[PDB]
Scaffold this motif. Structure first.
Motif, mmCIF file in Angstrom:
data_model
loop_
_atom_site.group_PDB
_atom_site.id
_atom_site.type_symbol
_atom_site.label_atom_id
_atom_site.label_comp_id
_atom_site.label_asym_id
_atom_site.label_seq_id
_atom_site.Cartn_x
_atom_site.Cartn_y
_atom_site.Cartn_z
ATOM 1 N N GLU A 1 0.878 -1.201 0.000
ATOM 2 C CA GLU A 1 0.000 0.000 0.000
ATOM 3 C C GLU A 1 0.903 1.236 0.000
ATOM 4 O O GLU A 1 0.541 2.237 -0.633
ATOM 5 N N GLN B 1 2.568 1.573 -3.598
ATOM 6 C CA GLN B 1 1.490 2.108 -4.473
ATOM 7 C C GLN B 1 1.299 3.617 -4.241
ATOM 8 O O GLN B 1 1.128 4.330 -5.235
ATOM 9 N N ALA B 2 1.313 4.081 -2.994
ATOM 10 C CA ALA B 2 1.117 5.508 -2.646
ATOM 11 C C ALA B 2 2.286 6.334 -3.200
ATOM 12 O O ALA B 2 2.044 7.465 -3.686
ATOM 13 N N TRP B 3 3.500 5.773 -3.140
ATOM 14 C CA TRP B 3 4.746 6.349 -3.715
ATOM 15 C C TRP B 3 4.659 6.392 -5.248
ATOM 16 O O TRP B 3 5.072 7.386 -5.823
ATOM 17 N N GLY B 4 4.181 5.327 -5.885
ATOM 18 C CA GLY B 4 3.960 5.280 -7.341
ATOM 19 C C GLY B 4 3.034 6.392 -7.807
ATOM 20 O O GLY B 4 3.381 7.093 -8.754
ATOM 21 N N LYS B 5 1.884 6.542 -7.152
ATOM 22 C CA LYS B 5 0.855 7.566 -7.465
ATOM 23 C C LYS B 5 1.506 8.959 -7.400
ATOM 24 O O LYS B 5 1.322 9.723 -8.338
ATOM 25 N N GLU B 6 2.280 9.237 -6.345
ATOM 26 C CA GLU B 6 2.980 10.526 -6.087
ATOM 27 C C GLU B 6 3.957 10.827 -7.233
ATOM 28 O O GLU B 6 4.156 12.013 -7.536
ATOM 29 N N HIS B 7 4.554 9.798 -7.833
ATOM 30 C CA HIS B 7 5.588 9.892 -8.896
ATOM 31 C C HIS B 7 5.006 9.573 -10.268
ATOM 32 O O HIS B 7 5.796 9.434 -11.210
ATOM 33 N N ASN B 8 3.679 9.449 -10.384
ATOM 34 C CA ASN B 8 2.994 9.336 -11.689
ATOM 35 C C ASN B 8 3.407 8.028 -12.388
ATOM 36 O O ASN B 8 3.527 8.025 -13.617
ATOM 37 N N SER C 1 2.890 3.489 -12.551
ATOM 38 C CA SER C 1 1.877 2.411 -12.399
ATOM 39 C C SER C 1 2.577 1.053 -12.243
ATOM 40 O O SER C 1 3.797 0.972 -12.541
ATOM 41 N N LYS C 2 1.829 0.027 -11.815
ATOM 42 C CA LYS C 2 2.354 -1.353 -11.605
ATOM 43 C C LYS C 2 3.127 -1.828 -12.846
ATOM 44 O O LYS C 2 2.590 -1.720 -13.947
ATOM 45 N N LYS D 1 7.663 4.414 1.412
ATOM 46 C CA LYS D 1 7.456 5.690 0.687
ATOM 47 C C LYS D 1 8.616 6.646 1.008
ATOM 48 O O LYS D 1 9.213 7.203 0.083
#
Ligand SMILES: Cc1cn([C@H]2C[C@H](O)[C@@H](CO)O2)c(=O)[nH]c1=O
Ligand code: NI
Length: 330
Positions: free
Chosen positions: A41, A44-51, A53-54, A273
């Motif tokens: 989780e 994923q929150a770090w991915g969203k912040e850095h634009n 995806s999986k 994160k």
């Protein structure tokens, strides 16, 4: 102080170089509702912040057993330059991978690796959150008997156990703590039978510190509570994440309620994160040992369905741990 020799760099020409981060998961899997899920989780929150995806900047490698650790770490080195080993068991495998790939950065969660520049180590004072869980448990027991279901006998689960016992004792040393270990973090069936046994022997609260093994403890308490009045329900204490959702049931006498008393929190997601961001800024804390405790809110207690007397006992115990007046054993 001054900078006479200087040149302007237009924002149009600047970029920040990103990193790619992966977690190598332990036995429990990313659906354990606890430790490995918290890590995932967070990533994923770090991915969203850095634009991202999986499989486009972040991913997980699920380990099938101890032998899969090395394989998953080697796969991760293909495309990822920041690799988290999630669990004390990955100690040896991360050591070996970090020596093969001195250009990549590695993080071990829940144990320490010394003298490797490209490895950071993250530990939690799980004894301090265990203590608060103990205080909470003591202030709500009717039968003056509580359960502790551990995963694998270890330094890490010993901290929770020692902390939890110390915390029950600080309120009422009369109270008996039944301790049993499932020998696994991914065995729901063993959790069910250990919980069944602890409840049958007169425990009314079980602290489950067994990862996905804990799904069994929730399933057991659900069955007992689904065939009783809300008045006489038995409790479980959650671990790693707020596990309130897992405690939803209907009483025998028609009433919707919740048998999760309280949860110990271990901010594994937050650590993933924050270190992923340090890694990306070229400030990876290589060779260092990051200790998270009650002070910096890396561990805490969520007082979901606890009584007001319980909440006060916890705040007072927290205060004394932060002071230094109470020292919690390991
Ligand atoms: C689920 C899981 C938990 N753990 C440990 C760390 C957690 O804080 C504790 C209880 O979830 O068990 C592991 O080491 N590996 C696992 O796969
Ligand atoms: Ni110049």
């Amino acid at each position: 102080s001054s900078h006479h020799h200087h040149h302007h760099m237009s924002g149009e020409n600047l970029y920040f170089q990103g990193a790619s981060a992966a977690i190598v998961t332990d036995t429990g899997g990313v659906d354990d509702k606890s430790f490995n899920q918290s890590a995932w989780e967070g990533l994923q929150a770090w991915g969203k912040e850095h634009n991202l995806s999986k499989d486009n900047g972040f991913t997980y490698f699920q380990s099938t057993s101890e032998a899969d650790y090395a394989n998953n770490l080697q796969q991760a080195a293909g495309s990822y330059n920041l690799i988290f080993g999630v669990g004390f068991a990955l100690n040896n495998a991360v050591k070996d991978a970090a020596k093969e790939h001195t250009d990549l950065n590695y993080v071990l969660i829940d144990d320490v690796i010394k003298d490797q520049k490209n490895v950071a180590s993250v530990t939690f004072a799980d004894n301090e959150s265990g203590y608060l869980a103990g205080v909470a448990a003591a202030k709500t027991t009717k039968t003056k008997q509580v359960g502790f279901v551990g995963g694998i006998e270890s330094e890490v689960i010993s901290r929770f156990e020692a902390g939890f016992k110390a915390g029950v004792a600080s309120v009422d040393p009369s109270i008996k703590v039944q301790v049993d270990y499932a020998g696994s973090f991914g065995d729901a069936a063993k959790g069910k039978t250990i919980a069944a046994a602890q409840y049958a022997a007169g425990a009314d609260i079980v602290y489950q510190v067994a990862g996905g093994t804990g799904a069994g403890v929730f399933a057991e308490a659900k069955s007992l509570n689904e065939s009783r009045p809300e008045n006489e329900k038995v409790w479980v204490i959650g671990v790693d994440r707020d596990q309130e959702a897992e405690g939803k049931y209907t009483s025998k006498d028609g009433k919707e309620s919740n048998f999760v008393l309280v949860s110990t929190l271990k901010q594994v997601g937050t650590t993933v994160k924050d270190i992923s961001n340090k890694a990306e800024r070229g400030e990876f804390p290589g060779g260092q040992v990051i200790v998270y405790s009650l002070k910096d809110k890396g561990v805490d207690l969520a007082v979901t369905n606890l009584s007001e007397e319980g909440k006060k006992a916890v705040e007072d115990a927290k205060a004394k741990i932060l002071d230094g007046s109470v020292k919690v054993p390991e």
